[PDB]
Curated annotation (Swiss-Prot):
Domain Ricin B-type lectin positions: 13-129
Name the record gives this protein: Endo-1,4-beta-xylanase A
Organism lineage: Bacteria, Bacillati, Actinomycetota, Actinomycetes, Kitasatosporales
Native source organism of the sequence: Streptomyces lividans
Subcellular location: Secreted
Entry's family note: Belongs to the glycosyl hydrolase 10 (cellulase F) family.
Protein encoded by which gene: xlnA
Record function comment: Contributes to hydrolyze hemicellulose, the major component of plant cell-walls. XLNA and XLNB seem to act sequentially on the substrate to yield xylobiose and xylose as carbon sources.
Disulfide bonds: C16-C35, C58-C75, C99-C118
Length: 129
């Protein structure tokens, strides 16, 4: 079946999880960007816990600590490519237990995305559209 990916939209910023310049390259760090219908803002949940983009790329935690980059890499089944959306709006990395976090409490276009200790601040709350 089709992916049917949807947005991951930040509550504090009103902006969407976005792969810069619609790049598909491994290791590309994510950012906030104005929400649009483009495929670089479409994130498809799977039963394996992934958030997929471009069919076979995965939202990817480069590490397990505060400030570790959130990026894309080809999907391969790693626990650092597994994510859970919680009732408090947090998107938590399964491996690390850390939250998707807009760096520095930034809201603007280009604000980078990292892992960070969960605080439930508005830069850590998300909706799926
Ligand atoms: O990174 C900012 C922004 O990039 C857009 O991609 C542009 C790209 O920057 C430009 O060089 C090219 O000519 O057109 C692309 C499509 O507009 C993304 O579309 C946007 O989502 C952001 O990711
Ligand atoms: O890892 C960065 C961290 O930034 C926090 O925001 C802080 C920022 O670090 C500080 O320079 C500024 O004076 O206060 C901000 C809080 O209002 C975020 O809260 C946190 O989630 C991380 O993004």
């Amino acid at each position: 079946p089709p992916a049917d990916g949807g947005q991951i939209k930040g509550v504090g910023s009103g902006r969407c999880l976005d792969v810069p310049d619609a790049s598909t390259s491994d290791g590309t760090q994510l950012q906030l960007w104005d929400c649009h219908s483009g495929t670089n803002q479409q994130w498809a949940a799977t039963d394996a816990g992934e958030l997929r983009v471009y069919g076979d790329k995965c939202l990817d935690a480069a590490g397990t600590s505060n400030g570790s980059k959130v990026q894309i890499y080809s999907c391969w089944g790693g626990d650092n490519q597994k994510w859970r959306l919680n009732s408090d709006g947090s998107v938590v990395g399964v491996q690390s237990g850390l939250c998707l976090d807009a760096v520095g409490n930034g809201t603007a276009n280009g604000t980078l995305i990292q892992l960070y200790t969960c605080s439930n601040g508005s830069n850590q709350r998300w909706t799926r559209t």
